[PDB]
A paper describes a structure:
Here we report near-atomic models built into cryo-EM structures of procapsid I, intermediate procapsid II which has partially released the SP, and the mature DNA-filled capsid from bacteriophage SPP1. The structures are T = 7 laevo icosahedra composed of 415 copies of the MCP gp13 (35.4 kDa), several hundred copies of SP gp11 (23.5 kDa) inside procapsids, 180 copies of gp12 in DNA-filled capsids, and a gp6-gp7 complex which forms the specialised portal vertex. The asymmetric units (ASUs) comprise seven SPP1 gp13 subunits: six in a hexon (subunits A to F) and one from the capsid penton (subunit G). Gp13 has the characteristic L-shape of capsid proteins of other tailed bacteriophages, with well-defined A and P domains, an extended N-terminus arm, and the E-loop.
The mature virion capsid (MVC) packed with DNA was reconstructed from images of the infectious SPP1 phage particles. The MVC has the same size and protein shell thickness as procapsid II. The capsid is filled with densely packed dsDNA appearing as concentric layers of density. The opening is closed in the MVC state whose hexon is nearly flat and only 1 nm longer than in procapsid II. The overall fold of the 324 amino acids-long SPP1 gp13 in the MVC is similar to gp5 in the mature empty capsid of phage HK977 in spite of only 12% sequence identity. During transition from procapsid II to the post-DNA packaging capsid state (MVC) hairpin β6–β7 of the hexons unfolds to form the A-loop, which turns outwards closing the hexon central opening. Subunits A to E remain nearly unchanged during transition from procapsid II to the MVC. In contrast, subunits F and G undergo a significant structural rearrangement similar to the transition of subunits A–E from procapsid I to procapsid II when the SP is released. Gp12 binds to a ring of six Glu197 that converge from the tip of the A loop closing the hexamer central hole. The major structural change found in hexons of the mature capsids is the outward motion of the A loops, probably caused by DNA packaging inside the capsid, closing the central openings and creating the binding site for the gp12 trimeric auxiliary protein.
Author numbering:
A (entry chain E): 110 to 324
B (entry chain E): 2 to 55
C (entry chain F): 56 to 217
D (entry chain F): 272 to 324
The structure:
């Protein structure tokens, strides 16, 4: 067993890092009116995510534009996109299924994105639009990055990892409140509340918009 | 009578292990986050450790 | 046959006044089935000499291609079993019943993406005649034309059709 | 003739069958198969639909 698990350990950390990232963004835009200018909401049951609302999100930065490049996505979303993509001209059927780019913009497909649930079986999707390149982070180092020990009288053997890293957008200033510690913060606590931006107007650079999927 | 499949004894078989791979593809890369600066490096390497700078 | 499922779990809050805990690995099982079949046939004799040719010769000549349709019969049976009435499979199936929805141009896309991230592991599509027909009659362009295209149309969208 | 066939795919289970072996046609279709992977890499999908009016 130890051989196998040791073989797999490497790619494990990836999904952890990702888990952190989505958490932290969710925090940044959480419930802070200071950010209202960078977000958009299509909820209340009208609006489909098509071809227009996308444009609004694109221009939500008024003068500066084309600092946006790549679009976050979820499967079913891209699906609905396709089923509206079908031309009447031309044809049934030639095109098509997968379509990078969308409009002069990269697209990245992933199955794991924040998805909430209300009653009445109404799904809601997020789909960050960043095109940033980027936020920032640095590796950092501990001491004793890897070690192995064993219980001598019982029969066991172990592995450990324990790595440091530093990550945040600049971007909003971090604040100290409502946290035990310290440090680090936490997952939940890193998402909890109380971040305060200062620039403001532009050059963040990220926008999110929530939308219902096409009927 | 018969040789009667109730009689000669049938073995069983095995082959070595094969590693399964759980799949939910984790990318959401490349994007923010990327692009380490020198400053967050000034957080990174010792000495003058945390907590975090300003 | 066995397998070893891959590891997962949280990192942790690396912290003093406390220690870590190691973690574990699991295993799993898989099965299969052996099956076996056969049949026979025969004739009279008097009939053979009185009829002007030999039945046994003919039937022996045809025997070969016979087994095909049997194998097929097995296959459809077994798939029908796999997806039968087992909620464990719900994620791989779709139902358009209740009298709305036509099989056109969209639902097909849904079926295509019913595997969310991984895709293009799908290649060829099963079909029935009348289905392909209805496909064609919706395939008629308004542009262009009446009439140039068309009847048979492999591929459908970048996908084989049988 | 003998032959062996199955997807891997769902694990086969032993229930509700006389025998043995093989199973049967009907019995091979009857019930009680239990998958383990799960999520993906089966790889097959079916969908039922009414024909165009």
């Amino acid at each position: 067993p130890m051989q196998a698990i040791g073989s797999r350990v490497a790619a494990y950390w990836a999904r952890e890092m990702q888990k952190i990232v989505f958490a932290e963004l969710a925090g940044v835009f959480s419930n802070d009116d200071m950010k209202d200018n960078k977000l958009d909401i299509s909820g209340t049951a009208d609006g489909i995510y098509s071809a227009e609302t996308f444009v609004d999100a694109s221009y939500k930065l008024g003068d500066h534009e084309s600092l946006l490049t790549a679009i976050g996505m979820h499967s079913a979303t891209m699906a609905s996109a396709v089923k509206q993509d079908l031309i009447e001209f031309v044809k049934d059927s030639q095109s098509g299924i997968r379509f990078p780019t969308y409009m002069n913009k990269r697209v990245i497909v992933d199955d794991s994105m924040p998805v909430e649930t209300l009653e009445d079986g109404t799904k809601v999707f997020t789909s960050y639009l960043f095109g940033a390149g980027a936020l920032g982070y640095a590796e950092g180092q501990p001491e004793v990055p890897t070690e192995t020990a064993r219980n001598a009288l019982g029969s066991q053997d172990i592995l450990i990892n324990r790595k440091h890293f530093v990550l945040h957008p600049r971007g909003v200033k971090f604040t100290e409140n409502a946290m035990a510690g310290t440090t680090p913060t936490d997952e939940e606590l890193a998402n909890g509340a109380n971040w305060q931006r200062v620039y403001d107007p532009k050059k963040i650079r990220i926008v999110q918009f929530k939308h219902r999927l096409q009927a | 009578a018969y040789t009667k499949i109730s009689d000669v004894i049938v073995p069983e078989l095995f082959n070595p292990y094969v590693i399964n791979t759980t799949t939910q593809l984790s990318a959401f890369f490349q994007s923010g986050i990327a692009a380490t600066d020198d400053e967050l490096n000034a957080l990174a390497k010792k000495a003058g450790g945390g907590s975090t700078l300003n | 046959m066995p397998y070893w499922n891959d590891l997962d779990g949280d990192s942790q809050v690396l912290n003093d006044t406390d220690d870590l805990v190691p973690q574990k690995i699991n295993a799993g099982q898989d099965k299969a089935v052996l099956i076996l079949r056969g049949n026979a046939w025969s004739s009279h004799d008097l009939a053979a000499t009185l009829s002007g040719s030999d039945p046994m010769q003919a039937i022996g000549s045809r025997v070969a291609a016979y087994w095909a349709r049997e194998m097929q019969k097995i296959v459809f049976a077994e798939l029908a079993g796999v997806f039968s009435n087992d909620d464990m499979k719900d994620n791989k199936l779709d139902i358009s019943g209740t009298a709305d929805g036509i099989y056109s141009a969209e639902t097909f896309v849904d079926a295509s993406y019913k595997l969310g991230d991984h895709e293009s592991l799908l290649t060829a599509i099963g079909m029935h005649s009348a289905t392909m027909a209805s496909a064609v009659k919706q395939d008629l362009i308004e542009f262009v034309k009446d009439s140039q295209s068309g009847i048979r149309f492999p591929t459908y969208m970048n996908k084989r059709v049988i």
